[PDB]
Design an enzyme around this catalytic site. Structure first.
Site: not given
Length: 124
Positions: A7, A42, A44-45, A85, A119-120
Protein backbone atom coordinates in the site's frame (compact mmCIF):
# COMPACT_ATOMS: atom_id res chain seq x y z
CA UNK A 1 -4.50 -9.09 0.55
CA UNK A 2 -2.57 -5.79 -0.05
CA UNK A 3 0.29 -5.56 2.53
CA UNK A 4 1.00 -2.30 4.40
CA UNK A 5 4.33 -2.23 2.54
CA UNK A 6 2.58 -2.74 -0.84
CA UNK A 7 0.00 0.00 0.00
CA UNK A 8 2.91 2.40 0.76
CA UNK A 9 4.43 1.48 -2.63
CA UNK A 10 1.12 1.99 -4.49
CA UNK A 11 0.36 5.34 -2.76
CA UNK A 12 3.87 6.84 -2.56
CA UNK A 13 6.50 5.26 -4.84
CA UNK A 14 7.16 6.39 -8.40
CA UNK A 15 10.78 5.55 -9.20
CA UNK A 16 10.17 5.60 -13.07
CA UNK A 17 10.37 9.44 -13.37
CA UNK A 18 13.20 11.70 -12.01
CA UNK A 19 10.72 14.59 -11.25
CA UNK A 20 7.00 15.53 -11.69
CA UNK A 21 6.47 14.23 -15.28
CA UNK A 22 4.14 17.20 -16.13
CA UNK A 23 1.39 19.63 -14.96
CA UNK A 24 -0.89 16.53 -15.63
CA UNK A 25 1.15 14.12 -13.43
CA UNK A 26 -0.97 14.22 -10.22
CA UNK A 27 -4.23 14.06 -12.20
CA UNK A 28 -3.04 10.80 -13.92
CA UNK A 29 -1.19 9.24 -10.93
CA UNK A 30 -3.87 9.90 -8.25
CA UNK A 31 -6.39 8.03 -10.51
CA UNK A 32 -4.07 5.20 -11.70
CA UNK A 33 -2.81 4.38 -8.13
CA UNK A 34 -6.54 4.27 -7.15
CA UNK A 35 -6.42 7.26 -4.72
CA UNK A 36 -9.56 8.83 -6.37
CA UNK A 37 -11.71 5.62 -6.26
CA UNK A 38 -13.92 6.30 -3.14
CA UNK A 39 -13.21 10.09 -2.84
CA UNK A 40 -10.56 12.63 -3.97
CA UNK A 41 -7.64 11.92 -1.60
CA UNK A 42 -6.89 15.59 -0.75
CA UNK A 43 -3.05 15.43 -0.56
CA UNK A 44 -0.49 12.79 -1.52
CA UNK A 45 3.27 12.62 -2.12
CA UNK A 46 5.12 10.44 -4.68
CA UNK A 47 8.83 9.70 -4.22
CA UNK A 48 11.14 9.45 -7.27
CA UNK A 49 13.94 7.40 -5.79
CA UNK A 50 14.68 3.68 -5.84
CA UNK A 51 12.63 1.39 -3.58
CA UNK A 52 15.90 0.39 -1.84
CA UNK A 53 16.76 4.06 -1.12
CA UNK A 54 13.29 4.72 0.39
CA UNK A 55 13.40 1.43 2.37
CA UNK A 56 16.83 2.46 3.74
CA UNK A 57 15.19 5.52 5.41
CA UNK A 58 13.85 3.11 8.07
CA UNK A 59 17.50 2.90 9.30
CA UNK A 60 18.07 6.75 9.15
CA UNK A 61 17.15 9.71 11.43
CA UNK A 62 14.53 8.66 14.00
CA UNK A 63 11.98 11.47 14.52
CA UNK A 64 8.58 11.78 16.17
CA UNK A 65 5.64 11.06 13.86
CA UNK A 66 2.85 13.67 13.54
CA UNK A 67 0.53 11.22 15.39
CA UNK A 68 2.93 11.10 18.37
CA UNK A 69 4.23 7.63 17.61
CA UNK A 70 8.04 7.15 17.66
CA UNK A 71 8.49 5.04 14.49
CA UNK A 72 9.18 7.82 11.93
CA UNK A 73 12.42 8.30 10.10
CA UNK A 74 13.81 11.25 8.15
CA UNK A 75 16.06 10.75 5.11
CA UNK A 76 19.60 12.05 5.55
CA UNK A 77 19.66 12.92 1.84
CA UNK A 78 17.14 15.06 -0.02
CA UNK A 79 14.90 13.08 -2.38
CA UNK A 80 13.03 13.97 -5.57
CA UNK A 81 9.30 14.07 -4.72
CA UNK A 82 6.01 15.27 -6.23
CA UNK A 83 3.30 16.76 -3.98
CA UNK A 84 -0.32 16.41 -5.24
CA UNK A 85 -2.88 18.86 -3.74
CA UNK A 86 -6.57 18.72 -4.73
CA UNK A 87 -7.68 22.05 -6.38
CA UNK A 88 -10.49 24.02 -4.62
CA UNK A 89 -12.74 23.33 -7.72
CA UNK A 90 -12.00 19.54 -7.92
CA UNK A 91 -15.30 17.56 -7.61
CA UNK A 92 -15.36 13.72 -7.33
CA UNK A 93 -15.31 11.73 -9.56
CA UNK A 94 -13.22 14.27 -11.64
CA UNK A 95 -10.50 14.71 -8.98
CA UNK A 96 -8.12 17.52 -10.08
CA UNK A 97 -4.71 18.20 -8.56
CA UNK A 98 -1.89 20.71 -8.61
CA UNK A 99 1.46 18.96 -9.29
CA UNK A 100 4.52 20.36 -7.43
CA UNK A 101 8.05 18.96 -7.74
CA UNK A 102 10.52 19.43 -4.89
CA UNK A 103 13.77 18.01 -3.51
CA UNK A 104 13.25 17.50 0.22
CA UNK A 105 14.00 15.11 3.08
CA UNK A 106 11.17 12.59 3.45
CA UNK A 107 9.73 11.36 6.75
CA UNK A 108 8.20 7.86 6.70
CA UNK A 109 6.74 5.61 9.38
CA UNK A 110 8.18 2.10 9.39
CA UNK A 111 6.85 -1.17 10.82
CA UNK A 112 7.15 -4.94 10.61
CA UNK A 113 9.80 -7.60 10.11
CA UNK A 114 11.22 -6.69 7.77
CA UNK A 115 11.14 -3.06 8.96
CA UNK A 116 9.81 -1.14 5.98
CA UNK A 117 7.94 2.04 5.14
CA UNK A 118 4.16 1.81 5.68
CA UNK A 119 3.23 5.55 5.82
CA UNK A 120 4.44 8.85 4.36
CA UNK A 121 4.39 11.40 7.19
CA UNK A 122 5.95 14.62 5.81
CA UNK A 123 8.65 16.21 3.76
CA UNK A 124 10.95 18.91 5.18
Amino acid sequence: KETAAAKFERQHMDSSTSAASSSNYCNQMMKSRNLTKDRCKPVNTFVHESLADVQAVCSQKNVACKNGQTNCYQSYSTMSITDCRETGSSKYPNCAYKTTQANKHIIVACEGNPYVPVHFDASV
